[PDB]
Design a protein around this ligand. Structure first.
Ligand SMILES: [Mg+2]
Ligand SMILES: [Mg+2]
Ligand SMILES: [Mg+2]
Ligand SMILES: [Mg+2]
Ligand SMILES: [Mg+2]
Ligand SMILES: [Mg+2]
Ligand SMILES: [Mg+2]
Ligand SMILES: [Mg+2]
Ligand SMILES: [Mg+2]
Ligand SMILES: [Mg+2]
Ligand SMILES: [Mg+2]
Ligand SMILES: [Mg+2]
Ligand SMILES: [Mg+2]
Ligand SMILES: [Mg+2]
Ligand SMILES: [Mg+2]
Ligand SMILES: [Mg+2]
Ligand SMILES: [Mg+2]
Ligand SMILES: [Mg+2]
Ligand SMILES: [Mg+2]
Ligand SMILES: [Mg+2]
Ligand SMILES: [Mg+2]
Ligand SMILES: [Mg+2]
Ligand SMILES: [Mg+2]
Ligand SMILES: [Mg+2]
Ligand SMILES: [Mg+2]
Ligand SMILES: [Mg+2]
Ligand SMILES: [Mg+2]
Ligand SMILES: [Mg+2]
Ligand SMILES: [Mg+2]
Ligand SMILES: [Mg+2]
Ligand SMILES: [Mg+2]
Ligand SMILES: [Mg+2]
Ligand SMILES: [Mg+2]
Ligand SMILES: [Mg+2]
Ligand SMILES: [Mg+2]
Ligand SMILES: [Mg+2]
Ligand SMILES: [Mg+2]
Ligand SMILES: [Mg+2]
Ligand SMILES: [Mg+2]
Ligand SMILES: [Mg+2]
Ligand SMILES: [Mg+2]
Ligand SMILES: [Mg+2]
Ligand SMILES: [Mg+2]
Ligand SMILES: [Mg+2]
Ligand SMILES: [Mg+2]
Ligand SMILES: [Mg+2]
Ligand SMILES: [Mg+2]
Ligand SMILES: [Mg+2]
Ligand SMILES: [Mg+2]
Ligand SMILES: [Mg+2]
Ligand SMILES: [Mg+2]
Ligand SMILES: [Mg+2]
Ligand SMILES: [Mg+2]
Ligand SMILES: [Mg+2]
Ligand SMILES: [Mg+2]
Ligand SMILES: [Mg+2]
Ligand SMILES: [Mg+2]
Ligand SMILES: [Mg+2]
Ligand SMILES: [Mg+2]
Ligand SMILES: [Mg+2]
Ligand SMILES: [Mg+2]
Ligand SMILES: [Zn+2]
Lengths: 157, 208, 68, 105
RNA sequence: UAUAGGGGCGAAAGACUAAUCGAACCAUCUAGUAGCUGGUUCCCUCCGAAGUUUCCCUCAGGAUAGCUGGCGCUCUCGCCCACGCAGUUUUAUCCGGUAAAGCGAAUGAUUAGAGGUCUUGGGGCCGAAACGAUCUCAACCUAUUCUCAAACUUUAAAUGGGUAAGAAGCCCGGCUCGCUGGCGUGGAGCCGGGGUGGAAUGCGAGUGCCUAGUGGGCCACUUUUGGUAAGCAGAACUGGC
RNA sequence: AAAUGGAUGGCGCUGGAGCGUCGGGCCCAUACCCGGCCGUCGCCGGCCUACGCCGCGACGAGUAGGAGGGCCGCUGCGGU
RNA sequence: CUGUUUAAUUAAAACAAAGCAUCGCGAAGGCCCGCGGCGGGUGUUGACGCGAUGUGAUUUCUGCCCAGUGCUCUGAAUGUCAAAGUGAAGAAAUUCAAUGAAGCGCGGGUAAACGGCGGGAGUAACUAUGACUCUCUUAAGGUAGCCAAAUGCCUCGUCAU
RNA sequence: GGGGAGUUUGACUGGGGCGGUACACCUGUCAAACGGUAACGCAGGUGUCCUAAGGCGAGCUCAGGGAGGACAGAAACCUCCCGUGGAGCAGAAGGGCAAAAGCUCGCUUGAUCUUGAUUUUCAGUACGAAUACAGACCGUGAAAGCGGGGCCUCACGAUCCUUCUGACCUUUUGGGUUUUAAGCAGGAGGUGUCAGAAAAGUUACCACAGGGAUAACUGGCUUGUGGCGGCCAAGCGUUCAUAGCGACGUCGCUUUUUGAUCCUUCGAUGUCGGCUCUUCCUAUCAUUGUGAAGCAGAAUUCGCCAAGCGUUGGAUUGUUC
RNA sequence: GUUUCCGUAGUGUAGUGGUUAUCACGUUCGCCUAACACGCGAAAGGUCCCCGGUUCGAAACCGGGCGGAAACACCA
RNA sequence: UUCGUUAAAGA
RNA sequence: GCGGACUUAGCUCAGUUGGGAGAGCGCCAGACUGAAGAUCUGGAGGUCCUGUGUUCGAUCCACAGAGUUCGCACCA
RNA sequence: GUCUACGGCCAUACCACCCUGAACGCGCCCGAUCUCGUCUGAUCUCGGAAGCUAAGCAGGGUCGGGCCUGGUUAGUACUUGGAUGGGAGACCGCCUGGGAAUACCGGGUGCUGUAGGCU
């Protein structure tokens, strides 16, 4: 009763935002898409040959197959029953990388460097990411001036 | 003409006269200024305005009857060209009617549920100004009495406020007399142009 | 005789009665669905690995075990 | 629509692009002594009335125009079929148009 | 005495035909069929729902999926540290275009005043007429100003969705390729070796078969469509009957 | 201003048994804690009906439905 | 009119009726029964008869349309039209071609057969009313009569009693 | 050939029918910033069109505005400048597009044959549509590359049967040849109720199994409509707003009308009016006691306490009226 | 109320298969006649219901109103 | 073959 | 789907064993009459439904198609 | 301190107007016989090199328009979760958390890779 065709809710989602119409930039193409690359999906309005679907916009998947001028991505899509790994063929203009895995590899490199320093100098490192700790017993300063007294203001329309 | 008891506080999305409505008749109000329309800014110093309190819908016929009552009290108190009243509110929301009996059950149930356009009302937020009257300094109480006569005619509860600003502009009456003479404000009809300092120098050379 | 048409009420609760599952277990991912020219690369590479890997990798393992 | 007389299309006998005479496909006269025709005559003979159903409520007004493509080359004679989408009026092979034509209504 | 059942007979009401006639009676097929009413017989224990997706001459029904039960199987804790999981949070990483706000920003509406002068059109005025010249209205432009938009928008929340937080991961060395190709170039596969202390909290997990019932729902805070409104009709999250 | 006579539940209540802000005590549900007993489940002990005997701990509602136990019961058959 | 009928909710304006009409039939026949026979009813009958219909005494009339649907007459001069029969090709099954019996069509009649019968505009010494005229129109355009009727929504139509 | 026989009379539906298709597929909103998400919700569509409006390459920039130029004017043709999409892309909209996906020109049918994979609806079934590949034969371009229909979102169809196409294919039954027939693979003939039965009406002579899942009475929610009050006062009232009235606006009450819904009632609550009879309310027609008038008297009008008691006989219509 | 159809000179109309102002009656002028009717030849007379969108171009294609003409409004 | 009308009076 | 019939001037029609378009009613202008009608004379008006093929030449021959009509048969 | 060829980020780098440009380079320019395509050597191609920075171009400037960023707007409008909070409703207030935009004001206006040449 909504007449579920292809892209029936995409008035804003597959649109180039503002002051960014025209030809596609070439650094979108000039990227290294190997296997296992955790990449995002963000649809385009210029190239109509490789729109994934309206359901896969903003999702994040893993590359399994690479071809001449597209790529193949496995994406966990949620349906009524349970989430499913689905094999999609999306062109290159719709795909950018995800920097979360890059930050994790930076943390792995720093942990390997700290473990090398630990094995070298016998120094304990605490390489586990502890979360935001409670504030320690720090010591404030109020020199020079008295604390400014604040009062609530009267009501004026 | 249905009563205003059945068309009240907002329960629908705004449905304006547009490409998709195409069927609303003409509104009751057509004009919006009644006083001295060509009044300059330095002529009438103060203004009193009428602030709503309830998130309601005011009808165009209510705006008509209220502006007629306020105009009549103004021309009986301070005469013609001694005031300038502006209805700030403009009606755009189109209410709908689902009429029947056109004493029988055998014409229409709830089959065609969507209704035809009846008239135009105006969605009013809390604090939105209904009317504003600018006058002289000596006509302080007459604006109060005119908006008080309009208060009994608008539905719901609403208050009156004598503004700190100099008339219809957004600048203060305390700063107006000291600041239009030195640098910034230049009168342009009933409105006031505020110039910044980020202009070309030809504007400053045309001044002074 | 008009009935209720469609709803999604009392559906997510039935979904979470049984613990919505990731597939969560794919070691050595499934190989079908990949470019047949790449398959003509990989299968011929695998069968010539089965054929001609013996002596060079054996002597290399002996060399790295002698040097290690 | 308009299709031409000749067309160079892949024929499956020699495996190269060869020109093809393009003709309109007549449906063809139905032959007696076919399997379902003899079965329907055997089922119809007797006091049974109309045994198999007969179609009544036609709704489509157009038919898919299919083209008989024949290989023009001698001693090949590759004949096959190419379907087009649904069209109401169908010009056979002539009267191409231009852009500098006056309206002259 | 004659007319006997889809027959008789009817001055015609479809009336009469053995208390039955818009098709008599008796027996048989026959325990006709029914998605439709009513009913369905001892106790205790354990687990325990749905009125929803899709399809059907489908709408009082059924099939399928979902929810549920039963039967197990494969493993794991039980003697500085295993794997895995989550209606949860954090750390990053992307996604949106709703509330809001705006229209002196595009689209669409809409109010009033001012300044400017190319323009044609209404008036009288300098006067044989004259873009020779004067005033005003008309319209246009400029800079303002009033009020909005579910099918407008530059901006853009809160809430929310996907992904990663390791031994299936890093690093090194080498073989294969009929893929690719300046190049032992690239890319995949295969082999060998080295280091598991890699966010918070909680939890022992994975998997196979068979199947009942369900397929008429309702109410409430909140977000909402039609209606004046309804203990009205229809949607979303959560909870309850 | 509405139709039988009637509803802060009624009775009554004004230095309150009304209204708004509150303080200290007090009353109870199958809710919570401790304890006795039954049952289910989980983990377990023993070379004492092994289908029995103990040990510890956590939980028990429920229509449609699905299982398990019955030294519940009726009728008849072979053993006893 | 006398008569008859819904026995057990109707007694009638209902049915029947004489009168008026129409059609089929000269018996190897008209209308019917029967599973069957040259078997039966009308028929021990013969157009002043039998069978089938509409209207319903007497008086006065039976308006106009065969466009439609039926019925009927007429012709191988003539389209279409099935078996069987004919001719050709072939090894044969089979295919093709001509000829064509009824029916339909083509032509006529039939309304006491089913049935049907108009809306506009302008026009006479005050006004209305409008004999009259013009246009589109069908097959024919409601004629003689009758009426707010047992038939008229507006309607408790208007006037008189 | 209704003389007789058998069978059918789609579904949704604020009861049924008529009306409509919300029955198949699209666009934007509802849709609450992932996605999905309803109604006979809203605004608009579709059963086509195209041998080019497909594919490639090259060249050029559109709509509009200003200024000029013989006839020439508001619009005939040319030139210069401004010109970010204000035009065009076949059609309903949304998105997108400027040495372009737009206009013109030149060649060409890739709108060709074939096996798998994936996305969409979804049960992760099918059809339809689409995407990335792969293998042949090609088009264009100098080459890069692009192209296996339309810039994308829709524009379409199962089993059985028929017809056509293909192998120098298989079986035609004891063995050969030949005609024929059957099969294999893919196009068509079509199921618009669009996952697809072949289907007219009436029953007031009706029957059966059921439903208050579902109308026609009351009662229940609401008060649009009806009726009855109030608020501010522009005016009527010779003067004078409020003795009596009161528009333009606006707030309410009641169920004596009507409407909306379907909550109970379908193994039945006997469904209009009249007669007789009892009781209750006040929004008072009269009577008792009062206030105010444009209350001289009389007669009226507007209010308060007030339902104790009265509130007719008839012609008409079945009447309520 | 719902579904179809129509609106054009003073009057009844034709005309879209997009790009006109068509016929007939009526008015005015002049002729034939002694003069009228009749007859003739011209002329005027159109907001193609009003307001908008499609395009090079609309009355025509479409939409919102305006005013009409047919059909239905049944069971309780 | 067809061709309509012209009052009241006026000798 | 089969067989067969008709498309001509503004209207109704004619026209083969093919050398090609006419009759009547229409329109216009003359004459006749005191005027009209009839009559006489002189003009204007055919895309013969469309495309192709044979012939030197096709309205007439054939094929295909486009509107109208007549019967006939109906497995999805 | 620059430019040329190819570029990446796509206005901090676009538009209007005014000044500056030494040397390579870019260009305007100088003519159609061959390659070339036009109504026109105007556009595109062919061998130049007499002048010129007038223009493009490259810098700078405008209390410049725009663009980006930062204050203000504002802990406001909104908003997850809660209450036997208020009010007849309309809506509003409180606890816990998150938190936007226009006006108004202030600052900037290109950064770079590869290959090559001038001072
Ligand atoms: Mg349901
Ligand atoms: Mg058989
Ligand atoms: Mg037979
Ligand atoms: Mg029988
Ligand atoms: Mg009896
Ligand atoms: Mg019966
Ligand atoms: Mg029987
Ligand atoms: Mg039984
Ligand atoms: Mg339990
Ligand atoms: Mg279906
Ligand atoms: Mg159902
Ligand atoms: Mg039931
Ligand atoms: Mg099931
Ligand atoms: Mg289980
Ligand atoms: Mg949205
Ligand atoms: Mg908003
Ligand atoms: Mg069961
Ligand atoms: Mg059920
Ligand atoms: Mg509801
Ligand atoms: Mg409960
Ligand atoms: Mg009390
Ligand atoms: Mg208290
Ligand atoms: Mg239990
Ligand atoms: Mg009786
Ligand atoms: Mg006889
Ligand atoms: Mg008689
Ligand atoms: Mg007669
Ligand atoms: Mg024969
Ligand atoms: Mg004859
Ligand atoms: Mg005849
Ligand atoms: Mg008259
Ligand atoms: Mg008459
Ligand atoms: Mg029958
Ligand atoms: Mg139904
Ligand atoms: Mg959404
Ligand atoms: Mg959401
Ligand atoms: Mg230019
Ligand atoms: Mg568009
Ligand atoms: Mg756009
Ligand atoms: Mg190009
Ligand atoms: Mg290929
Ligand atoms: Mg029947
Ligand atoms: Mg009766
Ligand atoms: Mg009867
Ligand atoms: Mg009312
Ligand atoms: Mg109900
Ligand atoms: Mg009811
Ligand atoms: Mg309900
Ligand atoms: Mg009962
Ligand atoms: Mg009773
Ligand atoms: Mg009873
Ligand atoms: Mg009393
Ligand atoms: Mg005379
Ligand atoms: Mg040359
Ligand atoms: Mg040349
Ligand atoms: Mg030159
Ligand atoms: Mg320069
Ligand atoms: Mg210079
Ligand atoms: Mg600059
Ligand atoms: Mg600036
Ligand atoms: Mg809240
Ligand atoms: Zn070939």
């Amino acid at each position: 009763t909504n007449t579920k065709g292809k892209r029936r809710g995409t008035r804003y989602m597959f649109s180039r935002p503002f002051r960014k119409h025209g030809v596609v930039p070439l650094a979108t193409y000039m990227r290294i898409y190997k296997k296992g690359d955790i990449v995002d999906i963000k649809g385009m309005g210029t190239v109509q040959k490789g729109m994934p679907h309206k359901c896969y916009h903003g999702k994040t998947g893993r590359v399994y197959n690479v071809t001449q001028h597209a790529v193949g991505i496995v994406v966990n899509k949620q349906v009524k029953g349970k989430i499913l790994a689905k094999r999609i063929n999306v062109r290159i203009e719709h795909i950018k990388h995800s920097k979360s895995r890059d930050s994790f590899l930076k943390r792995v490199k720093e942990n390997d460097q700290k473990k090398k320093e630990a094995k070298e100098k016998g120094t304990w490192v605490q390489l586990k990411r502890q979360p935001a700790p409670p504030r320690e017993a720090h010591f404030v300063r109020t020199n020079g001036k008295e604390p400014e007294l604040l009062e609530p203001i009267p009501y004026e329309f | 003409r249905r009563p205003a008891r059945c068309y009240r506080y907002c329960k629908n999305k705004p449905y304006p006269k547009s490409r998709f409505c195409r069927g609303v008749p003409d509104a009751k109000i057509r004009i919006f200024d009644l006083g001295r329309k060509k009044a300059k800014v330095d002529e009438f110093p103060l203004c009193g305005h009428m602030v709503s309190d309830e998130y309601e819908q005011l009808s165009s016929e209510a705006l008509e009857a209220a502006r007629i009552c306020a105009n009549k009290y103004m021309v009986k108190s301070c005469g013609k060209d001694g005031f300038h009243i502006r209805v700030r509110l403009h009606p755009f929301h189109v209410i709908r009617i689902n009429k029947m009996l056109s004493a029988d059950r055998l014409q229409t149930g709830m089959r065609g549920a969507f209704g035809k356009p009846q008239g135009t009302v105006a969605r009013v937020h809390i604090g939105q100004v209904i009317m504003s009257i600018r006058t002289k300094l000596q006509n302080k109480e007459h604006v109060i009495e005119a908006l008080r006569r309009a208060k009994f005619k608008f539905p719901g509860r609403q208050k009156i406020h004598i503004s700190k600003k100099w008339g219809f502009t957004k600048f203060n009456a305390d700063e107006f007399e000291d600041m239009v003479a030195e640098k910034r404000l230049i009168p342009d009809g009933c409105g006031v142009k505020y110039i910044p300092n980020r202009g070309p120098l030809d504007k400053w050379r045309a001044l002074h | 005789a008009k009935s209720k048409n469609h709803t999604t009420h009392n559906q997510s609760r039935k979904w979470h009665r049984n613990g919505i599952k990731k597939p969560r277990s794919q070691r050595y991912e499934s190989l079908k669905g990949v470019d047949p020219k790449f398959l003509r690369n990989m299968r011929f590479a695998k069968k010539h690995n089965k054929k001609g890997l013996k002596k060079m990798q054996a002597n290399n393992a002996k060399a790295m075990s002698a040097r290690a | 629509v308009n299709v031409p007389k000749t067309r160079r299309t892949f024929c499956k006998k020699c495996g190269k692009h060869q020109p093809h005479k393009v003709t309109q496909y007549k449906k063809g006269k139905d032959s007696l002594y076919a399997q379902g025709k003899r079965r329907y005559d055997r089922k119809q003979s007797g006091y049974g009335g109309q045994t198999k159903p007969i179609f009544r409520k036609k709704a489509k007004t157009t038919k898919k125009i299919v083209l008989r493509l024949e290989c023009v080359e001698p001693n090949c004679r590759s004949k096959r079929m190419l379907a087009i989408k649904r069209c109401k009026h169908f010009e056979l092979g002539g009267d191409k148009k231009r852009k500098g034509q006056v309206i002259q209504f």
